[PDB]
Design a protein around this ligand. Structure first.
Ligand SMILES: *[C@@H]1O[C@H](CO)[C@@H](O[C@@H]2O[C@H](CO)[C@@H](O[C@@H]3O[C@H](CO)[C@@H](O)[C@H](O)[C@@H]3O)[C@H](O)[C@H]2NC(C)=O)[C@H](O)[C@H]1NC(C)=O
Ligand SMILES: *[C@@H]1O[C@H](CO)[C@@H](O[C@@H]2O[C@H](CO)[C@@H](O)[C@H](O)[C@H]2NC(C)=O)[C@H](O)[C@H]1NC(C)=O
Ligand SMILES: *[C@@H]1O[C@H](CO)[C@@H](O[C@@H]2O[C@H](CO)[C@@H](O)[C@H](O)[C@H]2NC(C)=O)[C@H](O)[C@H]1NC(C)=O
Ligand SMILES: CC(C)Cc1ccc([C@H](C)C(=O)O)cc1
Ligand SMILES: [Fe+3]
Ligand SMILES: [Zn+2]
Ligand SMILES: [Zn+2]
Length: 341
């Protein structure tokens, strides 16, 4: 059935998509929206087929009837010569990161500091750290906990957007797409590295990928792992090598979602597209790589080894788990079941 329309979020994902579209022979084409929620509406209307989503957005989409199709999978220590496509996903570690030089900042003294978040509604950037903090303060006024924030996706006039920079020209401040300089895993870690915020809520991988030479980006060239600490829930501070034992939670991997009636077809095309543009793919290193965009995580995370079949044919609830779903239900109370569209 066998053409797929991919939904790109913002102009740089559009660029990368049009490139993929060309190389694929128009087997994949591109719709673009300004936000993930908008791409979710395109999918429901049937005007696009699929896009890859963080867990907090798999929640939104799943209430509207969309279904997990294929999950991002990275380099697992355990689970050895099992083919990547069939290997269970591990999850990723959500962490809070601070500068070592900012002595005496711990989980217990976050109040009134400056924070950097991936975007409103994302797992490691928003849902986990704010669900914890609402639980802890027994208060729904998360908008008043940090003194200033960059939380792309909140009111550009509020203090939740005060730290956001916008694009090259200072436009589009606090849009939840990669035009916002501090958007996403990479933008929130940048927000911290340049000392705009005191704390970044990212995942474990982000600190490694942008330190000790792994990046090459001008802001990240000189960043050293030993210059950062993770904040643990018991009040302590650990080197970034201790994430197994100092994280806020383990997150379900980003996954491709589609409308249930398109799922089989979307799944077939993507297995064949990764055969060509994935890690060992026929055409990757030389014509086109799907999982590469210079640390920008465009369409897919740059560390993705493959897209993996699911097994258990899970619903979105089962995919996310009862642990994670009740956390979001509870947090959403502050802002009991319906498609928000
Ligand atoms: C913030 O606090 C709320 C309220 O405590 C957390 O939601 C609550 O989560 C618990 C445990 O995950 C749910 O209870 C039960 O857990 C046992 C353990 O296996 C299980 O056997 C039961 O099936 C049940 O799920 C409980 O429903 C839920 N409570 C309410 C009133 O909603 C939430 O996890 C916390 N937020 C974060 C992000 O930490
Ligand atoms: C565009 O899509 C079609 C359908 O998948 C591809 O044409 C098929 O290629 C497969 C695998 O190489 C063959 O075994 C089929 O017999 C072909 N026929 C069909 C189903 O039409 C084509 O490979 C795709 N093009 C690119 C460059 O990605
Ligand atoms: C935190 O993230 C880093 C970055 O992904 C993980 O380290 C990588 O681990 C794989 C094998 O598991 C190695 O092949 C890579 O060379 C490592 N990458 C880098 C950039 O150093 C690390 O394992 C994660 N830590 C935990 C505890 O999950
Ligand atoms: C660790 C992460 C990748 C996911 C994860 C955790 C639990 C479950 C089951 C269905 C559940 O917790 O309800 C599924 C997936
Ligand atoms: Fe995420
Ligand atoms: Zn844990
Ligand atoms: Zn099931």
């Amino acid at each position: 059935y066998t053409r797929v329309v991919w939904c790109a979020v913002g102009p740089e994902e559009q660029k990368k998509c049009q490139q993929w579209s060309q190389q694929s022979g128009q087997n994949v084409t591109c719709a673009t929206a300004s936000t993930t929620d908008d791409c979710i509406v395109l999918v429901l209307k049937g005007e696009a087929d699929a896009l890859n989503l963080d867990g907090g957005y798999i929640y939104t989409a799943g209430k509207c009837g969309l279904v997990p199709v294929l999950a991002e999978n990275r380099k697992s220590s355990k689970h050895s010569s099992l083919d990547c496509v069939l290997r269970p996903t591990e999850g990723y570690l959500a962490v809070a990161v601070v500068k070592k030089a900012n002595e005496g900042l711990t989980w217990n003294s976050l109040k009134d500091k400056k924070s950097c978040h991936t975007a409103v509604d994302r797992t490691a950037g928003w849902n986990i750290p704010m669900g914890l903090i609402v639980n802890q303060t027994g208060s729904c006024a998360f908008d008043e906990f940090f003194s200033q924030s960059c939380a792309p996706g909140a009111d550009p006039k509020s203090r939740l957007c005060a730290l956001c920079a916008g694009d090259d020209q200072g436009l589009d401040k606090c849009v939840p797409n990669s035009k916002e300089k501090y958007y996403g895993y990479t933008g929130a870690f940048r927000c911290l590295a340049e000392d705009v915020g005191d704390v970044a809520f990212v995942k474990n991988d982000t600190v490694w990928e942008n330190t000790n030479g792994e990046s090459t980006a001008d802001w990240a060239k000189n960043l050293k792992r030993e210059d950062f600490r993770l904040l643990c829930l018991d009040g302590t501070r650990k080197p970034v090598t201790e994430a197994q034992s100092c994280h806020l939670a383990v997150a379900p991997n980003h996954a491709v979602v589609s409308r249930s009636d398109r799922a089989a077809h979307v799944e077939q095309v993507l297995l064949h597209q990764q055969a060509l543009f994935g890690k060992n793919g026929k055409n990757c290193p030389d014509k086109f790589c799907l999982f590469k965009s210079e640390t920008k995580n465009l369409l897919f995370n740059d560390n993705t080894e493959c897209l993996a079949k699911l097994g258990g044919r899970p619903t979105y609830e089962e995919y996310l788990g009862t642990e994670y779903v009740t956390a979001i239900a509870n947090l959403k109370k502050c802002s009991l079941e319906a498609c928000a569209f």
